[model samples]
Target: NLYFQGADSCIQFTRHASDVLLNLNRLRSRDILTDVVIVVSREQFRAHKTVLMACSGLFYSIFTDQLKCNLSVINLDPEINPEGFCILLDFMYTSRLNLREGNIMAVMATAMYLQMEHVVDTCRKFIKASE
Candidate 1:
């Protein structure tokens, strides 16, 4: 057997990207949040996770550049909170997102206002090129 890092240490790069999504929504005001139940079938869960990951990565990239924060060091920062992170995780594992804007871009003004460029820019070259 190989060295077993913490359960959190071995995940793919996609995970690091999700935290950015979650933190971007911290400044908002919300009393209640919808919970993601784990009763769906395997196929449904896979599809959901796919879409959420794609969307979250796309959004995370957009914020990283526009916010001028390096993608490499999101975890080192103390100010980042775990907000829409669950949403991204669920989306990665289940392919669903609330699809509603939860203004929390206290760092960047446009993304905070749902201007969408920040969200759109973070995608890969294929998607970024097409757009």
Candidate 2:
């Protein structure tokens, strides 16, 4: 079927760890990494009005306007520097990962704490699926 034949595989490939590193390499010549990680322990985002309101407010920020729901955390890094938070922003957009190549522990731990369910799962499964 078309779903698993060509572009479908390509789409999935684009989100792969290897492709992520290649893209990241072009984007950042220097290794721009963070040393810290954020674990959002507030609560599971069960679509609560408060969380929704927060998300609304979050979306209201011009910062996240050009981003997709999945990649809102791309190029974010919250540990080393606040500006590094953009590493997480990138992940929010595409669920892209370089788990085997990059810091898997940091990525998974942060995703779990942040309640980014699909991303956490995607990253987790990427490890399992890649094999």
Candidate 3:
């Protein structure tokens, strides 16, 4: 045997993954390849269903089974804070959460509603650190 090595091997790289997400975010901003519209109060946000499902359990369930009609517009709970939902939606695409003291509560509430634990946790930490 001239060479001896493991027969099975795996390679892992994340640059491509990050780049894909970045491009998706850009596309989202440009309203390209977006399949769904999220309506909160008077405002509307355009997004990809796949991206939403990847980030939010609530979205996953809704997209998977709860939604019966082939609808492009998804109306959210009227009680949901539009500004907070907007911030969270941006975070889903960009992996960045812009948390401020004034918006923290709204963001946290929105995160909880979306069943996004990480965002909620981040909001909790931000509140703790600020106080």
Candidate 4:
């Protein structure tokens, strides 16, 4: 048993952090316990508000403010590419991103719009490597 000292107590750490995200994604796939729906153009993505808030700063702000008003559906800008947003949402849940040369720019744009710096950085590195 391993424990780390916190202010006045000890906290145990486990190595199953990855499994948490995996299970959340599985729940998402089954549409179980999903609390919000995000709409991008004609496409809709179902996800948990907590998961989105954890992954994207924009989501944190939106959910914090909007959820207080009991909003369950979010509508994104019409200019945002649905495919790119879909890929980003998948990455948020799975911790994996599938980027291609053709779609990298679109993904990057969507990531920026979502205020996901890590995703934006990954897209930048992918572009640099491809070049």
Q: Using TM-score as the measure, which candidate wins?
A: 3
Which 10-residue span in candidate 1 carries the lowest summed lDDT? 38-47
| TM-score on alpha carbons, each prediction | 0.24, 0.32, 0.86, 0.84
**What are the lDDT scores of the predictions, listed in order?**
0.33, 0.41, 0.87, 0.87
Give me the displacement of residue 47 in model 4, in angstroms. 0.4
Which residues of candidate 3, in runs, are more than 4 Å off? 1-8, 66-69
Clashing pairs in 4: none
lDDT (0-100) at residue 85 of candidate 1? Answer: 39
Residues 1-131, model 4: lDDT tens digits: 54455566767455357778899999999999999899999999999999998989888888788444267898999999999998889899887898888789999999999999988998898889867
How do the candidates rank by TM-score, highest first?
3, 4, 2, 1
What lDDT tens digits, residue by residue, belong to model 2 across residues 39-131?
Answer: 233211112122222322333342334543333232322342222223444444334444554565566666554555665686777678767
- Please give the TM-score that candidate 3 achieves against the real structure: 0.86
lDDT of each residue in 1-131, candidate 1, tens digit only: 32345568673454554455444333122312312221222211112222322444443454446453322222212232234333433434333433343522321232232233444344232244445
Q: Which stretches of candidate 4 lie over 4 Å from their true place?
A: 1-14, 66-69
Poorest stretch of ten by lDDT in candidate 4? 1-10
